[PDB]
XYZ file of C-alpha atoms in Angstrom:
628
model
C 88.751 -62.120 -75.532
C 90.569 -60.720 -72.118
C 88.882 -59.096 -69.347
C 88.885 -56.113 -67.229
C 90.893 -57.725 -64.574
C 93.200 -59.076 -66.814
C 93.876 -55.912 -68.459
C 94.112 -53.887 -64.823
C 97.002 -56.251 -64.280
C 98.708 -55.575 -67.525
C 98.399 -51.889 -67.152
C 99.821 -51.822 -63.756
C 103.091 -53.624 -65.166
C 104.335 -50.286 -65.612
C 105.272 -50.254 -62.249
C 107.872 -51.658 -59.987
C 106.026 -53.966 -57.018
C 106.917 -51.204 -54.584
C 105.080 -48.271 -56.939
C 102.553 -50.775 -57.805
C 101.458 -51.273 -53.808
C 101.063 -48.001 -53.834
C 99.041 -47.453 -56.840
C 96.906 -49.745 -56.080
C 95.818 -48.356 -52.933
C 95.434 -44.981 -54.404
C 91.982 -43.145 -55.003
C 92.518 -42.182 -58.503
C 92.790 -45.962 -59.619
C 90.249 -47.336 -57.481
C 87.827 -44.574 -59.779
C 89.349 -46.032 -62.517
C 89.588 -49.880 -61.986
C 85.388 -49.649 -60.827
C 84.542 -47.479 -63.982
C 86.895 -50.381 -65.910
C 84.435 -52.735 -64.446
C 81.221 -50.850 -65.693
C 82.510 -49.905 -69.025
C 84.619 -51.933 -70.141
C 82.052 -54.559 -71.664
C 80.140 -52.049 -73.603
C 83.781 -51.166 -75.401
C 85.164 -54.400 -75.663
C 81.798 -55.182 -77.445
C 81.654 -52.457 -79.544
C 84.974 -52.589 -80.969
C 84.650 -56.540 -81.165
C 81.731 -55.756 -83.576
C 83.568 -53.573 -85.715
C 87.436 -55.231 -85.860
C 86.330 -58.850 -84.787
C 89.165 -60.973 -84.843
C 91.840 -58.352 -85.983
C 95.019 -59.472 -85.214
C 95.184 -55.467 -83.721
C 92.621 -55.525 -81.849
C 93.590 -57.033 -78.394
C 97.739 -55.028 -78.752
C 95.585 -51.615 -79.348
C 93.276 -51.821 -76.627
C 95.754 -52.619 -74.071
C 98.035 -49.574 -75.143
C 94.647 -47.348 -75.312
C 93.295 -48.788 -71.571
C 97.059 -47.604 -70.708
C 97.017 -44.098 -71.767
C 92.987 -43.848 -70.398
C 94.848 -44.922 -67.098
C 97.724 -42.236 -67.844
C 95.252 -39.578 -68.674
C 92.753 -40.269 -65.778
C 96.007 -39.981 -63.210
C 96.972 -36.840 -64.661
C 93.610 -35.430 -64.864
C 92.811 -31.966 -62.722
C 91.167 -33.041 -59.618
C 88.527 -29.953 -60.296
C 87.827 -32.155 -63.429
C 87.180 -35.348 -61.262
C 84.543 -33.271 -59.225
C 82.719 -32.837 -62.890
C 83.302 -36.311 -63.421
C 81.522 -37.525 -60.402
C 79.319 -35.050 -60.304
C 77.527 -35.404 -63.739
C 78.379 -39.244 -62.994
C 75.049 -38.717 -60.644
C 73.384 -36.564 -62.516
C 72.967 -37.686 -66.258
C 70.207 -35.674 -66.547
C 72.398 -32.149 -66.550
C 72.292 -31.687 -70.213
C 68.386 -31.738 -69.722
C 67.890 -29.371 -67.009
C 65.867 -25.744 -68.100
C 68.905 -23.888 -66.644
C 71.416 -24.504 -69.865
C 71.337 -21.814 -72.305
C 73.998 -22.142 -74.685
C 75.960 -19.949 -77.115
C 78.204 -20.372 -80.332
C 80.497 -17.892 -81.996
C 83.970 -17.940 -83.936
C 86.558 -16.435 -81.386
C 88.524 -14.267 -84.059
C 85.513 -12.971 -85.632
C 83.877 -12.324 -82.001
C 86.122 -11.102 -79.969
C 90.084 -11.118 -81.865
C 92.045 -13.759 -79.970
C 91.446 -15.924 -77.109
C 92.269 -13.104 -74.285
C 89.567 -11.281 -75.816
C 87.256 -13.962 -75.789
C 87.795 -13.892 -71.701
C 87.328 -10.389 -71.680
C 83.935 -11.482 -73.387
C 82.911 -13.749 -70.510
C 80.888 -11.161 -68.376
C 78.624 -10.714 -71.348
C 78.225 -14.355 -71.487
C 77.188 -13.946 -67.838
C 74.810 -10.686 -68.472
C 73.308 -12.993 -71.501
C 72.350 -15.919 -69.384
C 74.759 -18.727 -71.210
C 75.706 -21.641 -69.212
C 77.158 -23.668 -72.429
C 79.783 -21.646 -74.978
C 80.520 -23.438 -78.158
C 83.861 -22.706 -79.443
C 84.517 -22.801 -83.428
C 87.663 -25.062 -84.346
C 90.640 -23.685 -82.479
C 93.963 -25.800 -83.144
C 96.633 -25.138 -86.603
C 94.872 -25.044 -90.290
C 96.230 -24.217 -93.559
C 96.815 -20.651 -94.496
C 94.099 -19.544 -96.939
C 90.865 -22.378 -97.140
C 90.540 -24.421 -94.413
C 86.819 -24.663 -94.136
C 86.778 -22.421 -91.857
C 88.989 -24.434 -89.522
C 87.278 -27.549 -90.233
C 90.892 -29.201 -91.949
C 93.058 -29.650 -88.704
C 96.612 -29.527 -89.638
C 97.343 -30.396 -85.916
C 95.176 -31.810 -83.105
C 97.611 -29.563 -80.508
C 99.040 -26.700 -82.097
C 96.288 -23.616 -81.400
C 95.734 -21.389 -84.169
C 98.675 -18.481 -83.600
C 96.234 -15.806 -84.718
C 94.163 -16.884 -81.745
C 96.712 -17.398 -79.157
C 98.568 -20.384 -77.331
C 97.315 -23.610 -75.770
C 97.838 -21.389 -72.436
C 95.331 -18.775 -73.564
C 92.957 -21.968 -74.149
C 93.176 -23.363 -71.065
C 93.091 -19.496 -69.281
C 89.280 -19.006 -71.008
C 87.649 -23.039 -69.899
C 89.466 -22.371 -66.523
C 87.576 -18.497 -66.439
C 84.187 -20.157 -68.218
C 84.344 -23.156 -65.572
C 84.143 -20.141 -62.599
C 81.374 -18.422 -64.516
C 79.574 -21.552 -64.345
C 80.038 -22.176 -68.261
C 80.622 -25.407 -69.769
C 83.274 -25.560 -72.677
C 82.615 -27.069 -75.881
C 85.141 -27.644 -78.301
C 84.689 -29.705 -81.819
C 86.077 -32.870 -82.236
C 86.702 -33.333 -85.948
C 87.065 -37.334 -86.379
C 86.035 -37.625 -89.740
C 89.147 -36.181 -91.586
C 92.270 -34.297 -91.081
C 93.717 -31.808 -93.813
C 96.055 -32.755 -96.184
C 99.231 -31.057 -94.200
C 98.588 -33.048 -91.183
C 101.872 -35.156 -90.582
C 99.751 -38.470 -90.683
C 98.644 -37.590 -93.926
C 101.923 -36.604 -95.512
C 103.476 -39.454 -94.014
C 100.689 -42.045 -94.504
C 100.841 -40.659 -98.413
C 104.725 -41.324 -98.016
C 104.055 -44.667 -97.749
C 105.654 -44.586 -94.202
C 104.736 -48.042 -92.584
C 103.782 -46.353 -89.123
C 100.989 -44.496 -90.908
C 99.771 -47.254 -93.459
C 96.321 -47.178 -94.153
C 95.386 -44.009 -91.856
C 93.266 -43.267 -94.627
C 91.944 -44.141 -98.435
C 94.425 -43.953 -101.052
C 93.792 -45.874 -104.370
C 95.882 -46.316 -107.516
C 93.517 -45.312 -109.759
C 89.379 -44.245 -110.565
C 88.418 -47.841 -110.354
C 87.458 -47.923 -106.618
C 86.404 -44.628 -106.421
C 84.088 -44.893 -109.676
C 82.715 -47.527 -108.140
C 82.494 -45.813 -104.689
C 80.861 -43.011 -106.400
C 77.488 -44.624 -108.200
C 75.976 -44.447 -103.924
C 78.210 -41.518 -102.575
C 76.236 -38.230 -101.500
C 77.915 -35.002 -102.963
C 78.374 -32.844 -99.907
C 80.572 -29.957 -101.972
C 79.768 -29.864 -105.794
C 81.339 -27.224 -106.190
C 84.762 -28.677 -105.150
C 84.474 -31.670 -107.146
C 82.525 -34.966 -108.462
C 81.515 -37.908 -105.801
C 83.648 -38.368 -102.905
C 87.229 -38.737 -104.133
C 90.257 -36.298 -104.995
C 93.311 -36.710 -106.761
C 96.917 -36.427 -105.825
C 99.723 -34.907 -107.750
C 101.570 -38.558 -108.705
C 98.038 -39.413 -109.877
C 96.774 -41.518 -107.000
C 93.560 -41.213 -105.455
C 91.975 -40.158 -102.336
C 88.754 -40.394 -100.235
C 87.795 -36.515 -99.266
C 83.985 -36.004 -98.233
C 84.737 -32.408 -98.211
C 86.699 -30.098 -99.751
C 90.062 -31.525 -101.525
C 92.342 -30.521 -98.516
C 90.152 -32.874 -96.005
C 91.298 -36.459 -96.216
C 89.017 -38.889 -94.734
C 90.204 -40.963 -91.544
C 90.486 -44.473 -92.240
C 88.708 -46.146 -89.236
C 88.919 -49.416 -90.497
C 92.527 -49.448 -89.207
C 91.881 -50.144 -85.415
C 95.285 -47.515 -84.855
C 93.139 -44.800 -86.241
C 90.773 -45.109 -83.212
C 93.559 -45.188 -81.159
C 94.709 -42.529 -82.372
C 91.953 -40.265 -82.450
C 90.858 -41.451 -78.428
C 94.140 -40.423 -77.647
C 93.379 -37.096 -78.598
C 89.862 -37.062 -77.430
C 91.782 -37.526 -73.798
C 93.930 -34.498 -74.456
C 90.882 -32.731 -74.833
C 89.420 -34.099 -72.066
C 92.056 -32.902 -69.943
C 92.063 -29.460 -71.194
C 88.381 -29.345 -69.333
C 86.385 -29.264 -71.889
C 82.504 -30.551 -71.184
C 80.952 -31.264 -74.437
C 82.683 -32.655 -77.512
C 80.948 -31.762 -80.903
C 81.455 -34.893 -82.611
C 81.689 -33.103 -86.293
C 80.212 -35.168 -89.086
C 79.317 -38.322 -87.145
C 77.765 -40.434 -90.030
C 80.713 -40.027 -92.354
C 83.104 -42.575 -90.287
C 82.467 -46.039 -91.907
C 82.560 -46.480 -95.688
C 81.064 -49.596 -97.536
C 80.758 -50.436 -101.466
C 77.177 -50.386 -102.603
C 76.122 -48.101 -99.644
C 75.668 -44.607 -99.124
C 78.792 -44.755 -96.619
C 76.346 -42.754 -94.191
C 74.875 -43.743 -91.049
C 76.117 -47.351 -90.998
C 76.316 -49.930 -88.140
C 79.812 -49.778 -87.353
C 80.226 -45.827 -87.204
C 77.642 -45.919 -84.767
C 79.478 -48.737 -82.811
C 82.252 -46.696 -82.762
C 81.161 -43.855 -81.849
C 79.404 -46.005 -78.410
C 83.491 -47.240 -78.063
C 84.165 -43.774 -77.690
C 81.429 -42.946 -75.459
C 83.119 -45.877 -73.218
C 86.429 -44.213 -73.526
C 85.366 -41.161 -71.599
C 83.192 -43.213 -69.095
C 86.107 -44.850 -68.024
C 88.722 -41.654 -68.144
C 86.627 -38.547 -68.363
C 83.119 -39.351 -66.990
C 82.367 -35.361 -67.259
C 82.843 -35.060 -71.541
C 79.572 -35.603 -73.362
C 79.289 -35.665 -76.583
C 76.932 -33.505 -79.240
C 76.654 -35.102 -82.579
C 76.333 -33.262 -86.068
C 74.372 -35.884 -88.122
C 72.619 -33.476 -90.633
C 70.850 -36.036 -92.787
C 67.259 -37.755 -92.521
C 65.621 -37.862 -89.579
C 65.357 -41.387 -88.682
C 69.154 -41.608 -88.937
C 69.610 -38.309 -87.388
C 68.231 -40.170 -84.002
C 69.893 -43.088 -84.200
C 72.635 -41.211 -82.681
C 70.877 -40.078 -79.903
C 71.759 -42.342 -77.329
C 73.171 -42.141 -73.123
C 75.384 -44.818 -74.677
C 76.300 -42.982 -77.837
C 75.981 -38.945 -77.890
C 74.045 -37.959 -75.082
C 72.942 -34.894 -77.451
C 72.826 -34.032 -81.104
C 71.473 -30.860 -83.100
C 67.890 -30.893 -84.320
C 68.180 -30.128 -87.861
C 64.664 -31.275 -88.318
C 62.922 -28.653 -86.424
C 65.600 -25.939 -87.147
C 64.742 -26.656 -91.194
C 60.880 -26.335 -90.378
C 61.025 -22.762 -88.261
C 62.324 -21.518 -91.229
C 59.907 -23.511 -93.404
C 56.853 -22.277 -91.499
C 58.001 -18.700 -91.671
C 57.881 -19.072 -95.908
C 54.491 -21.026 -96.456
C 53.029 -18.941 -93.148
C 51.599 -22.641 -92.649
C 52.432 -25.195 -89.517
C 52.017 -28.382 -90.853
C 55.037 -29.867 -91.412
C 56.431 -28.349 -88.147
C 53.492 -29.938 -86.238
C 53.933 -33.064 -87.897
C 57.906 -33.345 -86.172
C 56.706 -32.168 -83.323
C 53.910 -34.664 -82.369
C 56.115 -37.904 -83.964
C 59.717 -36.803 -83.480
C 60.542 -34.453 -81.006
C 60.612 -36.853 -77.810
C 63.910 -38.797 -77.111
C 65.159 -41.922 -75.189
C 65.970 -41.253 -71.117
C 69.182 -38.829 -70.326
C 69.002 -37.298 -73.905
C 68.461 -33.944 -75.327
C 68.401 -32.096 -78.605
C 70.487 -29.231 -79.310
C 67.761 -26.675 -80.521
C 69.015 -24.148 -82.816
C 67.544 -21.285 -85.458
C 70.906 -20.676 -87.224
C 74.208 -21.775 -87.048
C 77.798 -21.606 -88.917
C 76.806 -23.790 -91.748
C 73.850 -22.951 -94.536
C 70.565 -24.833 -93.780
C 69.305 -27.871 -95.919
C 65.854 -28.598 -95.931
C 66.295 -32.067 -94.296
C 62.713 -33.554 -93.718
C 61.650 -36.562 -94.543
C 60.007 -36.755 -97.986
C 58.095 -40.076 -96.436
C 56.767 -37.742 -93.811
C 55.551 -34.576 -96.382
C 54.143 -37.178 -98.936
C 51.638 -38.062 -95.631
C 50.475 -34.395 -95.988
C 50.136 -34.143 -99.486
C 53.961 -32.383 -100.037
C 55.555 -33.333 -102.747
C 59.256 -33.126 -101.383
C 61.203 -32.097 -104.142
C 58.901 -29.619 -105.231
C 58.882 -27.813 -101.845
C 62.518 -27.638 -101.394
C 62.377 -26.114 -105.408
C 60.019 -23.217 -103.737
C 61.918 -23.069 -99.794
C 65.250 -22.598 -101.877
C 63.868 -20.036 -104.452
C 62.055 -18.035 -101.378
C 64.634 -17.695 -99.045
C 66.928 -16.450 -101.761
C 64.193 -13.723 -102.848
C 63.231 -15.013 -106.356
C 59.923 -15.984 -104.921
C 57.503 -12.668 -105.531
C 57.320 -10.718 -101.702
C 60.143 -12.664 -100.363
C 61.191 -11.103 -97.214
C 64.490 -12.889 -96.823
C 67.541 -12.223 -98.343
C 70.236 -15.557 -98.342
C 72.504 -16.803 -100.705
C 72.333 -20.065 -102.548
C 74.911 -22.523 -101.609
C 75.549 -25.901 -103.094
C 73.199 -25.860 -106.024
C 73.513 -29.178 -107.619
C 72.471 -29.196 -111.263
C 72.171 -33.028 -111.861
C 70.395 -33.379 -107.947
C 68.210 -29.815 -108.067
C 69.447 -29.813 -104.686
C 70.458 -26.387 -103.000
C 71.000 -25.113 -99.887
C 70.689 -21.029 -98.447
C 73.383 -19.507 -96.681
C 72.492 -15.374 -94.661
C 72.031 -14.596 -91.020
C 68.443 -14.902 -89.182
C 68.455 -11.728 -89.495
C 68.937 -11.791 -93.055
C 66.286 -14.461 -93.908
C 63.907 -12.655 -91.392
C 63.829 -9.376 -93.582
C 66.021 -6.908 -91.303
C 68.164 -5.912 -93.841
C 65.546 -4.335 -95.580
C 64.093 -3.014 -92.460
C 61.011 -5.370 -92.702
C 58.494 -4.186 -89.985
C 57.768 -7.843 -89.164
C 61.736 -8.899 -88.816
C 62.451 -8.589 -84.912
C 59.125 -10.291 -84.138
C 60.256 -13.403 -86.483
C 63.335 -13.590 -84.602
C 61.717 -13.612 -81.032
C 59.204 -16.243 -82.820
C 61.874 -18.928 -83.795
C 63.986 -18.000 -80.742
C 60.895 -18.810 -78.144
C 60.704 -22.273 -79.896
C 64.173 -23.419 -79.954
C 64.002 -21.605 -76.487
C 60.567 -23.357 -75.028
C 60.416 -26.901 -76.565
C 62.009 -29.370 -74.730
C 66.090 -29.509 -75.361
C 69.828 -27.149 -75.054
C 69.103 -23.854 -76.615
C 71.732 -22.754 -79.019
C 72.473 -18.936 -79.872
C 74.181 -17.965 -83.116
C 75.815 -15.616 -81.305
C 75.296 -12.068 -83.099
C 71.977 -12.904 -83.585
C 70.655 -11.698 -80.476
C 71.146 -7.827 -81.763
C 70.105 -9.024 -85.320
C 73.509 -9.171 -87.073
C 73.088 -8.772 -90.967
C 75.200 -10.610 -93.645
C 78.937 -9.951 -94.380
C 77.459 -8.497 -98.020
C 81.263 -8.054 -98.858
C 82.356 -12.089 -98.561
C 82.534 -12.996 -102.399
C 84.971 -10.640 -103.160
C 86.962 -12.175 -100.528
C 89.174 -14.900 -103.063
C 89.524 -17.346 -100.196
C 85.613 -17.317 -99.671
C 84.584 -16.148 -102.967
C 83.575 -20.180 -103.310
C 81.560 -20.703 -100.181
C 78.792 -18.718 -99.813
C 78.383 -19.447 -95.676
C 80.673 -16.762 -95.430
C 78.003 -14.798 -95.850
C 76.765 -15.418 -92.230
C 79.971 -14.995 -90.569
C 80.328 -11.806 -90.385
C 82.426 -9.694 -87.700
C 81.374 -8.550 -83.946
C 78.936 -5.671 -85.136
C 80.393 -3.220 -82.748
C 77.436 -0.794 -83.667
C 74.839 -3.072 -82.735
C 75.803 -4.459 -79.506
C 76.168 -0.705 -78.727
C 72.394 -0.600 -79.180
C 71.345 -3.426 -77.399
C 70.276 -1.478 -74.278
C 68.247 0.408 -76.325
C 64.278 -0.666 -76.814
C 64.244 1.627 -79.969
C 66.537 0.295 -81.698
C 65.946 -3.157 -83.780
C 69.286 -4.468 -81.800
C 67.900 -3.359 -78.767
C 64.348 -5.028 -79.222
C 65.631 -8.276 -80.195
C 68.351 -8.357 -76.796
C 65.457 -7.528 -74.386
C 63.165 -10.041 -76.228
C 65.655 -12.776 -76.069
C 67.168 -12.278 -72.557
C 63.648 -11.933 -71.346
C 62.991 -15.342 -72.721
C 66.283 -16.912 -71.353
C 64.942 -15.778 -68.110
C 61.919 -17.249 -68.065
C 63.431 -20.630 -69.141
C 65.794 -20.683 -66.565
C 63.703 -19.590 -63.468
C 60.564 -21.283 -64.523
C 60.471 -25.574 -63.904
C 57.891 -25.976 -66.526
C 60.424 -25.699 -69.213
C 62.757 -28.401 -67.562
C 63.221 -31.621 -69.271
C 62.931 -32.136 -73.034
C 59.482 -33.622 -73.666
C 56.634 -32.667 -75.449
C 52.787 -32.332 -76.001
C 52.375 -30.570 -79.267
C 48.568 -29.099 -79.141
C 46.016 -28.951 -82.270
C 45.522 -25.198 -82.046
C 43.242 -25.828 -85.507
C 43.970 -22.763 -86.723
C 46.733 -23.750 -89.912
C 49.401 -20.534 -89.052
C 49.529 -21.414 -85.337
C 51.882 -24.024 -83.578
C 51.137 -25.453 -80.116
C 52.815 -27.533 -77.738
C 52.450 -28.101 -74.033
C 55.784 -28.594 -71.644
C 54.953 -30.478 -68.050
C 51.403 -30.289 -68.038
C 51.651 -27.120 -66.895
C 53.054 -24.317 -69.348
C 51.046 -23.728 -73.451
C 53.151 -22.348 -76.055
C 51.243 -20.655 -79.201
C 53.655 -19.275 -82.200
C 51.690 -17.196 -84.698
C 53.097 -17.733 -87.864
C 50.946 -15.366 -90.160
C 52.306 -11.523 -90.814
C 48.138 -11.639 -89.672
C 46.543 -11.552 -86.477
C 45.310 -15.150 -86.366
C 43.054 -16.850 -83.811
C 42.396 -19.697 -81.938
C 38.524 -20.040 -80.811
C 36.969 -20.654 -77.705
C 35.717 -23.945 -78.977
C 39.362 -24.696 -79.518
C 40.018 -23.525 -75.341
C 37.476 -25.380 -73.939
C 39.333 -27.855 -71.571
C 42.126 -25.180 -70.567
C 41.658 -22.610 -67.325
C 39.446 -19.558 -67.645
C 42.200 -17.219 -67.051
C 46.304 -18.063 -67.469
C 49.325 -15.880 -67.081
C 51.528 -15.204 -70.172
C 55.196 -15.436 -69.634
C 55.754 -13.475 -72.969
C 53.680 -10.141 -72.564
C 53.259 -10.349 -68.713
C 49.294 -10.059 -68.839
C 46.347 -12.581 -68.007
C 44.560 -13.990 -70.959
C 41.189 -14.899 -70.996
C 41.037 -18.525 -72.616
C 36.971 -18.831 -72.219
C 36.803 -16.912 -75.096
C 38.206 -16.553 -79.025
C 42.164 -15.846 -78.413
C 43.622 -13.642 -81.297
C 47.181 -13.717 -81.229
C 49.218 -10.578 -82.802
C 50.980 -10.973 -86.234
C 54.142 -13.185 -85.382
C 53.218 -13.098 -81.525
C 54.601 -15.796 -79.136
C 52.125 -16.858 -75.746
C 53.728 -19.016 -73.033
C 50.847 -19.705 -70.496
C 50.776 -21.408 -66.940
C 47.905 -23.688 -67.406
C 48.949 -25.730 -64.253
């Protein structure tokens, strides 16, 4: 094994004695030669672990430590300000101040000029953190909605050029906005040029991903492989017109990454440093436990796609100290930690309690969602979840069956009723999603529709607006960065028109993409309107967060409020959240209130409550009260 110092030397041979002197002496490398000495170990170690003694190993790292070195000396010296900046402060991502927001910049706001033009509304919403949906060159037609990069460089034309790009991080950055872009590792789509050419059988791009002769491998593959798209196909493997066969997770136009080739790191860290450069803050690391595959296992979550992912996280501590990364593991919660880590992704999404708000708001009981937040919510030091109520994707009921069988839920049987309910074909269903991914031989299913949609807006449900403020305060209150499906803050309904659509007519998440709602953002100044209610509710709450301390940080107290429909949870000591989850006033008793303050202020409604006697909160109503 080499060294830092040996491999300082050998990337400095680029240079004639004279440049070298002055190189040397420079500012930029001396960053970069002590962040070699920190880092370094953690990625020699981690790749060690994976490659071992691959003959590529040592040849790959030296070219990759050469173009971190290239990258870093290129970098925008704004971007080195970041770098050092969050370099003493690892803690940013946890801070009460970071509101963040997601939307599709087409469907938002047309192109990426428009999406500028957007950026005083990010301002008048409160965001601090603006998550971009997949921006670079896709197939025409399906793509996954952008999810099967045909190029890691080439910006979608129908949202602008690369210029445009770097126009809206540079006019985010002066709004004090981070930029978060996805970083799609996993796979490419099948029109990428390493695909075509790896399938080719050009030598350059040999074994870039998994290509077998014939069903033997991936029959075999398949007795342990999750089915992720059913609809698409069987198992995990798609075949190619001269009959040879491929690994795709996905869809049959996403090709699976082969990371046991050490160039296939190489190559996808040399675009995470062209990212990187552009200024983005926070990479989305998109399907995270998908990156290792192993016969007899699940090919999810293993050792060495979590080692990689920590050589990465070197990668950027050496050369771009500013980009964290967010992981998307959506699969059972002890795994879905696992890649929580200041060493790994410094964030992640919290499927977990996402999959519970809405549980809570079916059964109208807390149980479950007490249950993850007592034993699961808290993380390691300089982490944070990524708290969300809806997103791009369809939701899957992802708790752990171990964890409902302690409470008497039979797992299967609850996902049969949560999938049945939030579909309406449950009698008095309020919501109204779309099934997605139902799995005849698994029973498995998953439910696509707005917040809105599931909440009971479309319908004009008198209860709707205050189940969106409810889920909102939570993912708003708990301890972690708040995510906005952005749309949902004026209560956005389904695109009811999406199946009729014949390149979506086969993915019913489509359903929950729907267009800027001109007419409701219209509204949203307006406290009689349901648009209007939900903005003021919403902003008032990202207010709160942000100017009150007792949200800061992401840990948590949850509090037995002993009433079944009512969650509680304490932040600092010093601020008690209650969430009515009944459509009936519900209470929690005096007996119950014994050890708070007489009297506390509620964030929420503005007023004093008096906690030395019975407390009976409002259908649906939310109470944030200084206690300390």
């Amino acid at each position: 094994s080499p060294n830092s110092q040996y491999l300082k030397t050998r990337i400095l041979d680029i240079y004639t004695p004279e440049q070298r002197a002055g190189i040397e002496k420079s500012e930029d490398w001396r960053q970069f030669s002590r962040r070699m000495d920190t880092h370094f170990p953690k990625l020699m170690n981690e790749l060690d672990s994976v490659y071992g003694n691959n003959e590529a190993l040592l040849p790959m790292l030296e070219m990759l430590l050469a173009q971190a070195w290239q990258s870093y000396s290129q970098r925008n010296s704004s971007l080195k300000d970041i770098d050092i900046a969050r370099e003493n402060n690892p803690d940013w991502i946890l801070s009460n101040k970071q509101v963040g927001g997601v939307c599709y910049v087409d469907l938002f706001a047309g192109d990426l000029k428009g999406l500028k033009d957007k950026i005083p509304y990010f301002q008048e919403l409160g965001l601090t953190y603006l998550h971009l949906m997949p921006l670079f060159k896709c197939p025409e037609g399906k793509s996954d909605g952008g999810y099967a990069v045909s190029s890691y460089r080439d910006v979608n034309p129908a949202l602008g050029t690369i210029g445009d790009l770097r126009e809206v991080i540079a006019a985010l950055h002066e709004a004090g906005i981070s930029a978060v872009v996805d970083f799609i590792f996993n796979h490419t789509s099948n029109e990428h040029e390493w695909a075509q050419r790896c399938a080719a059988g050009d030598p350059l791009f040999d074994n870039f991903y998994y290509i077998f002769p014939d069903r033997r491998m991936p029959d075999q593959y398949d007795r342990t492989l999750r089915e992720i798209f059913p609809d698409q196909h069987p198992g995990g493997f798609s075949q190619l017109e001269d009959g040879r066969w491929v690994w795709t997770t996905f869809n049959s136009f996403q090709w699976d990454l082969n990371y046991s080739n050490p160039w296939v790191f190489r190559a996808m860290a040399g675009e995470m440093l062209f990212l990187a450069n552009l200024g983005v803050d926070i990479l989305r690391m998109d399907a995270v436990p998908l990156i290792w595959k192993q016969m007899g296992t699940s090919c999810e979550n293993l050792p060495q796609a979590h080692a990689l992912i920590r050589a990465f996280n070197a990668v950027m501590r050496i050369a771009a100290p500013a980009v964290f990364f967010k992981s998307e593991a959506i699969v059972h919660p002890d795994q879905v930690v696992q890649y929580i880590g200041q060493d790994e992704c410094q964030i992640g999404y919290n499927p977990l309690q996402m999959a519970l708000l809405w549980n809570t708001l079916a059964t109208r009981e807390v149980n479950l969602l007490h249950q993850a937040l007592t034993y699961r919510h808290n993380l390691p030091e300089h982490t944070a979840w990524v708290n969300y109520v809806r997103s791009h994707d369809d939701i899957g009921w992802t708790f752990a069956d171990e964890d409902a069988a302690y409470l008497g839920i039979s797992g299967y049987d609850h996902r049969q009723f949560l999938n049945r309910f939030f579909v309406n074909r449950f009698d008095g269903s309020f919501a109204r999603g779309v099934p997605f991914q139902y799995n005849p031989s698994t029973g498995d299913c998953r439910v696509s529709g707005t917040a809105a949609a599931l909440v009971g807006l479309a319908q004009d449900d008198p209860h709707a607006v205050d189940r969106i403020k409810l889920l909102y305060s939570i993912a708003l209150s708990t301890g972690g960065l708040p995510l906005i499906y952005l749309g949902d803050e004026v209560g956005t309904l389904n695109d009811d028109d999406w199946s009729q659509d014949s390149n979506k007519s086969d993915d019913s998440r489509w359903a929950h993409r729907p267009r800027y709602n001109e007419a409701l953002y219209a509204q949203r100044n307006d406290p009689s309107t349901a648009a209007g209610q939900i903005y003021q509710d919403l902003r008032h709450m990202i207010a709160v967060r942000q100017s009150n301390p007792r949200f800061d940080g992401g840990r948590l107290v949850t509090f037995n409020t002993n009433n079944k429909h009512i969650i509680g949870y304490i932040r600092n000591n010093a601020l008690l959240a209650f969430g009515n989850f009944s459509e009936y006033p519900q209470t929690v008793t005096a007996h119950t209130l014994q050890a708070m303050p007489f009297k506390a202020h509620d964030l929420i409604g503005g007023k004093t409550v008096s906690l030395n006697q019975d407390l009976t909160l409002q259908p649906y109503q939310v109470m944030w009260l200084e206690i300390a």
